[PDB]
mmCIF file of all heavy atoms in Angstrom:
data_model
loop_
_atom_site.group_PDB
_atom_site.id
_atom_site.type_symbol
_atom_site.label_atom_id
_atom_site.label_comp_id
_atom_site.label_asym_id
_atom_site.label_seq_id
_atom_site.Cartn_x
_atom_site.Cartn_y
_atom_site.Cartn_z
ATOM 1 N N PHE B 42 6.759 -23.150 -58.556
ATOM 2 C CA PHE B 42 5.909 -22.495 -59.506
ATOM 3 C C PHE B 42 4.448 -23.128 -59.415
ATOM 4 O O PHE B 42 4.024 -23.933 -60.279
ATOM 5 C CB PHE B 42 6.449 -22.734 -60.952
ATOM 6 C CG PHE B 42 7.689 -21.937 -61.204
ATOM 7 C CD1 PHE B 42 8.903 -22.281 -60.569
ATOM 8 C CD2 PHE B 42 7.695 -20.836 -62.055
ATOM 9 C CE1 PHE B 42 10.084 -21.551 -60.811
ATOM 10 C CE2 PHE B 42 8.889 -20.089 -62.280
ATOM 11 C CZ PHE B 42 10.086 -20.488 -61.722
ATOM 12 N N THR B 43 3.819 -22.761 -58.317
ATOM 13 C CA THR B 43 2.486 -23.330 -58.041
ATOM 14 C C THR B 43 1.402 -22.390 -58.745
ATOM 15 O O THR B 43 1.756 -21.352 -59.212
ATOM 16 C CB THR B 43 2.287 -23.307 -56.520
ATOM 17 O OG1 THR B 43 2.676 -22.073 -55.989
ATOM 18 C CG2 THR B 43 3.154 -24.455 -55.955
ATOM 19 N N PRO B 44 0.134 -22.873 -58.780
ATOM 20 C CA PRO B 44 -0.843 -22.111 -59.621
ATOM 21 C C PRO B 44 -1.160 -20.735 -59.156
ATOM 22 O O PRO B 44 -1.660 -19.918 -60.007
ATOM 23 C CB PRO B 44 -2.072 -22.993 -59.592
ATOM 24 C CG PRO B 44 -1.488 -24.399 -59.336
ATOM 25 C CD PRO B 44 -0.406 -24.100 -58.267
ATOM 26 N N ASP B 45 -0.856 -20.353 -57.926
ATOM 27 C CA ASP B 45 -0.975 -19.000 -57.494
ATOM 28 C C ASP B 45 0.141 -18.045 -57.967
ATOM 29 O O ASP B 45 0.048 -16.915 -57.846
ATOM 30 C CB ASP B 45 -1.084 -18.937 -55.965
ATOM 31 C CG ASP B 45 0.144 -19.511 -55.289
ATOM 32 O OD1 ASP B 45 0.522 -20.710 -55.718
ATOM 33 O OD2 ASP B 45 0.760 -18.924 -54.398
ATOM 34 N N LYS B 46 1.204 -18.733 -58.462
ATOM 35 C CA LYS B 46 2.376 -17.964 -58.896
ATOM 36 C C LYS B 46 2.701 -18.025 -60.439
ATOM 37 O O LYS B 46 3.344 -17.117 -60.950
ATOM 38 C CB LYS B 46 3.652 -18.537 -58.163
ATOM 39 C CG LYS B 46 3.557 -18.122 -56.664
ATOM 40 C CD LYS B 46 4.491 -18.767 -55.746
ATOM 41 C CE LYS B 46 4.364 -18.206 -54.342
ATOM 42 N NZ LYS B 46 4.027 -16.713 -54.356
ATOM 43 N N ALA B 47 2.194 -19.042 -61.085
ATOM 44 C CA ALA B 47 2.573 -19.365 -62.456
ATOM 45 C C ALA B 47 1.557 -20.062 -63.219
ATOM 46 O O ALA B 47 0.764 -20.834 -62.623
ATOM 47 C CB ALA B 47 3.900 -20.210 -62.438
ATOM 48 N N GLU B 48 1.483 -19.841 -64.499
ATOM 49 C CA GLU B 48 0.728 -20.541 -65.495
ATOM 50 C C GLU B 48 1.666 -21.170 -66.509
ATOM 51 O O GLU B 48 2.758 -20.641 -66.647
ATOM 52 C CB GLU B 48 -0.364 -19.754 -66.157
ATOM 53 C CG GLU B 48 0.297 -18.498 -66.875
ATOM 54 C CD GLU B 48 -0.697 -17.608 -67.612
ATOM 55 O OE1 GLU B 48 -1.980 -17.814 -67.510
ATOM 56 O OE2 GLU B 48 -0.271 -16.686 -68.241
ATOM 57 N N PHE B 49 1.219 -22.224 -67.140
ATOM 58 C CA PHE B 49 2.068 -22.913 -68.104
ATOM 59 C C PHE B 49 1.360 -22.994 -69.494
ATOM 60 O O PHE B 49 0.143 -23.338 -69.501
ATOM 61 C CB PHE B 49 2.384 -24.330 -67.691
ATOM 62 C CG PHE B 49 3.242 -24.308 -66.458
ATOM 63 C CD1 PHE B 49 2.612 -24.190 -65.148
ATOM 64 C CD2 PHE B 49 4.615 -24.450 -66.547
ATOM 65 C CE1 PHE B 49 3.432 -24.131 -63.969
ATOM 66 C CE2 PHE B 49 5.405 -24.432 -65.376
ATOM 67 C CZ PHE B 49 4.789 -24.272 -64.086
ATOM 68 N N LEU B 50 2.004 -22.640 -70.532
ATOM 69 C CA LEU B 50 1.513 -22.702 -71.908
ATOM 70 C C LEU B 50 2.544 -23.333 -72.764
ATOM 71 O O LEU B 50 3.736 -23.186 -72.570
ATOM 72 C CB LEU B 50 1.260 -21.280 -72.453
ATOM 73 C CG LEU B 50 0.267 -20.429 -71.610
ATOM 74 C CD1 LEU B 50 0.811 -19.698 -70.533
ATOM 75 C CD2 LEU B 50 -0.477 -19.491 -72.615
ATOM 76 N N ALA B 51 2.053 -24.084 -73.765
ATOM 77 C CA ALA B 51 2.903 -24.841 -74.701
ATOM 78 C C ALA B 51 2.603 -24.471 -76.071
ATOM 79 O O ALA B 51 1.455 -24.531 -76.501
ATOM 80 C CB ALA B 51 2.729 -26.361 -74.494
ATOM 81 N N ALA B 52 3.663 -24.100 -76.832
ATOM 82 C CA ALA B 52 3.511 -23.962 -78.301
ATOM 83 C C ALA B 52 3.533 -25.386 -78.821
ATOM 84 O O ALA B 52 4.532 -26.132 -78.561
ATOM 85 C CB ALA B 52 4.679 -23.111 -78.850
ATOM 86 N N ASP B 53 2.472 -25.790 -79.406
ATOM 87 C CA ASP B 53 2.264 -27.253 -79.553
ATOM 88 C C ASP B 53 2.844 -27.733 -80.885
ATOM 89 O O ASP B 53 2.233 -27.704 -81.920
ATOM 90 C CB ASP B 53 0.776 -27.520 -79.554
ATOM 91 C CG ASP B 53 0.486 -29.012 -79.472
ATOM 92 O OD1 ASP B 53 1.372 -29.875 -79.541
ATOM 93 O OD2 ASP B 53 -0.751 -29.401 -79.356
ATOM 94 N N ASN B 54 4.076 -28.296 -80.786
ATOM 95 C CA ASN B 54 4.746 -28.961 -81.911
ATOM 96 C C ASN B 54 4.675 -30.511 -81.744
ATOM 97 O O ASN B 54 5.491 -31.228 -82.315
ATOM 98 C CB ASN B 54 6.161 -28.485 -82.017
ATOM 99 C CG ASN B 54 6.288 -27.261 -82.793
ATOM 100 O OD1 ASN B 54 5.303 -26.609 -83.226
ATOM 101 N ND2 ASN B 54 7.534 -26.881 -83.131
ATOM 102 N N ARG B 55 3.717 -31.021 -81.027
ATOM 103 C CA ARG B 55 3.639 -32.467 -80.856
ATOM 104 C C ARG B 55 3.277 -33.205 -82.129
ATOM 105 O O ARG B 55 3.782 -34.344 -82.316
ATOM 106 C CB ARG B 55 2.680 -32.853 -79.734
ATOM 107 C CG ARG B 55 3.150 -32.373 -78.324
ATOM 108 C CD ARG B 55 2.108 -32.673 -77.325
ATOM 109 N NE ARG B 55 0.908 -31.796 -77.541
ATOM 110 C CZ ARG B 55 -0.220 -31.947 -76.925
ATOM 111 N NH1 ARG B 55 -0.339 -32.777 -75.880
ATOM 112 N NH2 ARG B 55 -1.280 -31.224 -77.297
ATOM 113 N N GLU B 56 2.523 -32.557 -82.994
ATOM 114 C CA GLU B 56 2.068 -33.256 -84.218
ATOM 115 C C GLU B 56 2.884 -32.883 -85.477
ATOM 116 O O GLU B 56 2.797 -33.560 -86.468
ATOM 117 C CB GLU B 56 0.592 -33.008 -84.524
ATOM 118 C CG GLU B 56 -0.270 -33.502 -83.424
ATOM 119 C CD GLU B 56 -1.797 -33.301 -83.689
ATOM 120 O OE1 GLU B 56 -2.116 -32.858 -84.817
ATOM 121 O OE2 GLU B 56 -2.593 -33.668 -82.800
ATOM 122 N N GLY B 57 3.579 -31.731 -85.394
ATOM 123 C CA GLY B 57 4.341 -31.223 -86.559
ATOM 124 C C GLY B 57 4.988 -29.933 -86.089
ATOM 125 O O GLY B 57 4.818 -29.478 -85.021
ATOM 126 N N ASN B 58 5.819 -29.387 -87.008
ATOM 127 C CA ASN B 58 6.562 -28.097 -86.808
ATOM 128 C C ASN B 58 5.656 -26.931 -87.019
ATOM 129 O O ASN B 58 5.936 -26.079 -87.940
ATOM 130 C CB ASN B 58 7.789 -28.101 -87.633
ATOM 131 C CG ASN B 58 8.908 -28.981 -87.142
ATOM 132 O OD1 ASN B 58 8.868 -29.378 -85.988
ATOM 133 N ND2 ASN B 58 9.833 -29.270 -87.999
ATOM 134 N N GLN B 59 4.543 -26.871 -86.250
ATOM 135 C CA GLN B 59 3.540 -25.788 -86.265
ATOM 136 C C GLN B 59 4.213 -24.442 -86.001
ATOM 137 O O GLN B 59 3.916 -23.404 -86.664
ATOM 138 C CB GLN B 59 2.570 -26.153 -85.120
ATOM 139 C CG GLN B 59 1.432 -25.221 -85.178
ATOM 140 C CD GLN B 59 0.190 -25.673 -84.582
ATOM 141 O OE1 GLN B 59 -0.854 -25.308 -85.137
ATOM 142 N NE2 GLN B 59 0.228 -26.431 -83.466
ATOM 143 N N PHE B 60 5.103 -24.412 -85.051
ATOM 144 C CA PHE B 60 5.908 -23.192 -84.643
ATOM 145 C C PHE B 60 7.356 -23.499 -84.894
ATOM 146 O O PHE B 60 7.804 -24.629 -84.984
ATOM 147 C CB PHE B 60 5.707 -22.943 -83.191
ATOM 148 C CG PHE B 60 4.302 -22.504 -82.895
ATOM 149 C CD1 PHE B 60 3.354 -23.389 -82.316
ATOM 150 C CD2 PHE B 60 3.855 -21.248 -83.288
ATOM 151 C CE1 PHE B 60 2.066 -23.026 -82.026
ATOM 152 C CE2 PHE B 60 2.544 -20.853 -83.053
ATOM 153 C CZ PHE B 60 1.664 -21.725 -82.435
ATOM 154 N N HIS B 61 8.122 -22.423 -85.005
ATOM 155 C CA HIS B 61 9.598 -22.508 -84.932
ATOM 156 C C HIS B 61 10.098 -21.472 -83.991
ATOM 157 O O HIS B 61 9.319 -20.743 -83.431
ATOM 158 C CB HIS B 61 10.218 -22.483 -86.362
ATOM 159 C CG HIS B 61 9.795 -21.245 -87.108
ATOM 160 N ND1 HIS B 61 10.417 -20.018 -86.875
ATOM 161 C CD2 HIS B 61 8.820 -21.066 -88.058
ATOM 162 C CE1 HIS B 61 9.797 -19.171 -87.663
ATOM 163 N NE2 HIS B 61 8.855 -19.785 -88.384
ATOM 164 N N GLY B 62 11.440 -21.388 -83.814
ATOM 165 C CA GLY B 62 11.993 -20.559 -82.819
ATOM 166 C C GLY B 62 11.812 -19.078 -82.990
ATOM 167 O O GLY B 62 11.821 -18.367 -82.085
ATOM 168 N N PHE B 63 11.669 -18.679 -84.310
ATOM 169 C CA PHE B 63 11.485 -17.275 -84.558
ATOM 170 C C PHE B 63 10.029 -16.826 -84.436
ATOM 171 O O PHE B 63 9.790 -15.570 -84.380
ATOM 172 C CB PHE B 63 12.133 -16.858 -85.911
ATOM 173 C CG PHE B 63 13.605 -17.089 -85.982
ATOM 174 C CD1 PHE B 63 14.173 -18.336 -86.271
ATOM 175 C CD2 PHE B 63 14.550 -16.010 -85.650
ATOM 176 C CE1 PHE B 63 15.495 -18.546 -86.324
ATOM 177 C CE2 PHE B 63 15.905 -16.280 -85.752
ATOM 178 C CZ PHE B 63 16.410 -17.542 -86.046
ATOM 179 N N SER B 64 9.082 -17.728 -84.606
ATOM 180 C CA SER B 64 7.684 -17.382 -84.644
ATOM 181 C C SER B 64 6.934 -17.640 -83.353
ATOM 182 O O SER B 64 5.863 -16.959 -83.143
ATOM 183 C CB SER B 64 6.991 -18.111 -85.801
ATOM 184 O OG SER B 64 6.928 -19.583 -85.511
ATOM 185 N N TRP B 65 7.388 -18.485 -82.469
ATOM 186 C CA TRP B 65 6.493 -19.000 -81.423
ATOM 187 C C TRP B 65 6.040 -17.877 -80.472
ATOM 188 O O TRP B 65 4.855 -17.881 -80.004
ATOM 189 C CB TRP B 65 6.980 -20.177 -80.751
ATOM 190 C CG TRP B 65 8.233 -20.008 -79.874
ATOM 191 C CD1 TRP B 65 9.489 -19.616 -80.221
ATOM 192 C CD2 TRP B 65 8.363 -20.461 -78.519
ATOM 193 N NE1 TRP B 65 10.384 -19.821 -79.200
ATOM 194 C CE2 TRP B 65 9.729 -20.364 -78.155
ATOM 195 C CE3 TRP B 65 7.435 -21.045 -77.620
ATOM 196 C CZ2 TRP B 65 10.191 -20.750 -76.837
ATOM 197 C CZ3 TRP B 65 7.904 -21.397 -76.352
ATOM 198 C CH2 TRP B 65 9.244 -21.265 -75.990
ATOM 199 N N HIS B 66 6.887 -16.937 -80.084
ATOM 200 C CA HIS B 66 6.502 -16.001 -79.075
ATOM 201 C C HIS B 66 5.311 -15.100 -79.503
ATOM 202 O O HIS B 66 4.539 -14.674 -78.629
ATOM 203 C CB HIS B 66 7.567 -14.966 -78.704
ATOM 204 C CG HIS B 66 8.870 -15.550 -78.253
ATOM 205 N ND1 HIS B 66 9.917 -14.749 -78.028
ATOM 206 C CD2 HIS B 66 9.267 -16.835 -78.056
ATOM 207 C CE1 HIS B 66 10.949 -15.513 -77.695
ATOM 208 N NE2 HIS B 66 10.586 -16.747 -77.670
ATOM 209 N N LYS B 67 5.105 -14.891 -80.824
ATOM 210 C CA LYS B 67 4.034 -13.999 -81.288
ATOM 211 C C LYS B 67 2.662 -14.595 -81.068
ATOM 212 O O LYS B 67 1.739 -13.807 -80.891
ATOM 213 C CB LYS B 67 4.312 -13.683 -82.723
ATOM 214 C CG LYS B 67 5.566 -12.773 -82.924
ATOM 215 C CD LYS B 67 6.385 -13.249 -84.128
ATOM 216 C CE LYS B 67 7.678 -12.382 -84.319
ATOM 217 N NZ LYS B 67 8.624 -13.127 -85.037
ATOM 218 N N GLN B 68 2.530 -15.934 -80.993
ATOM 219 C CA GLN B 68 1.285 -16.532 -80.629
ATOM 220 C C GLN B 68 1.214 -16.768 -79.102
ATOM 221 O O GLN B 68 0.092 -16.801 -78.557
ATOM 222 C CB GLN B 68 1.092 -17.859 -81.408
ATOM 223 C CG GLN B 68 0.499 -17.560 -82.693
ATOM 224 C CD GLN B 68 -1.044 -17.689 -82.711
ATOM 225 O OE1 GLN B 68 -1.706 -17.454 -81.695
ATOM 226 N NE2 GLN B 68 -1.557 -18.030 -83.786
ATOM 227 N N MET B 69 2.309 -16.861 -78.413
ATOM 228 C CA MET B 69 2.265 -17.150 -76.956
ATOM 229 C C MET B 69 1.962 -15.895 -76.164
ATOM 230 O O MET B 69 1.217 -15.887 -75.236
ATOM 231 C CB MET B 69 3.520 -17.811 -76.539
ATOM 232 C CG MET B 69 3.869 -19.109 -77.288
ATOM 233 S SD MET B 69 2.582 -20.411 -77.199
ATOM 234 C CE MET B 69 2.935 -20.811 -75.508
ATOM 235 N N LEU B 70 2.693 -14.813 -76.451
ATOM 236 C CA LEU B 70 2.642 -13.592 -75.628
ATOM 237 C C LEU B 70 1.244 -13.098 -75.400
ATOM 238 O O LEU B 70 0.857 -12.775 -74.263
ATOM 239 C CB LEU B 70 3.474 -12.419 -76.251
ATOM 240 C CG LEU B 70 4.958 -12.553 -76.056
ATOM 241 C CD1 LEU B 70 5.649 -11.488 -76.853
ATOM 242 C CD2 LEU B 70 5.268 -12.420 -74.564
ATOM 243 N N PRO B 71 0.412 -13.053 -76.389
ATOM 244 C CA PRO B 71 -1.001 -12.564 -76.173
ATOM 245 C C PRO B 71 -1.800 -13.353 -75.205
ATOM 246 O O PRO B 71 -2.752 -12.843 -74.627
ATOM 247 C CB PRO B 71 -1.650 -12.604 -77.599
ATOM 248 C CG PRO B 71 -0.483 -12.506 -78.541
ATOM 249 C CD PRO B 71 0.625 -13.266 -77.888
ATOM 250 N N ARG B 72 -1.424 -14.609 -74.992
ATOM 251 C CA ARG B 72 -2.131 -15.473 -74.099
ATOM 252 C C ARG B 72 -1.657 -15.424 -72.681
ATOM 253 O O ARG B 72 -2.252 -16.021 -71.803
ATOM 254 C CB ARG B 72 -2.090 -16.875 -74.593
ATOM 255 C CG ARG B 72 -2.729 -17.060 -75.971
ATOM 256 C CD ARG B 72 -2.473 -18.347 -76.584
ATOM 257 N NE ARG B 72 -3.411 -18.573 -77.692
ATOM 258 C CZ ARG B 72 -4.479 -19.362 -77.592
ATOM 259 N NH1 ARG B 72 -4.762 -19.961 -76.412
ATOM 260 N NH2 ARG B 72 -5.304 -19.558 -78.658
ATOM 261 N N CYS B 73 -0.506 -14.759 -72.416
ATOM 262 C CA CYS B 73 0.149 -14.684 -71.122
ATOM 263 C C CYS B 73 -0.460 -13.647 -70.268
ATOM 264 O O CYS B 73 -0.764 -12.591 -70.686
ATOM 265 C CB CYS B 73 1.618 -14.446 -71.316
ATOM 266 S SG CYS B 73 2.524 -15.791 -72.112
#
Side-chain angles (χ1 to χ4, degrees):
Chain B
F42 289 73
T43 50
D45 59 310
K46 291 169 175 324
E48 60 177 4
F49 295 83
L50 298 88
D53 192 353
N54 272 9
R55 294 174 296 170
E56 299 184 4
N58 288 339
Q59 185 159 216
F60 293 104
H61 56 78
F63 299 83
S64 67
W65 66 302
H66 305 174
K67 291 138 182 157
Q68 276 269 27
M69 302 304 287
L70 282 171
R72 297 170 166 260
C73 292

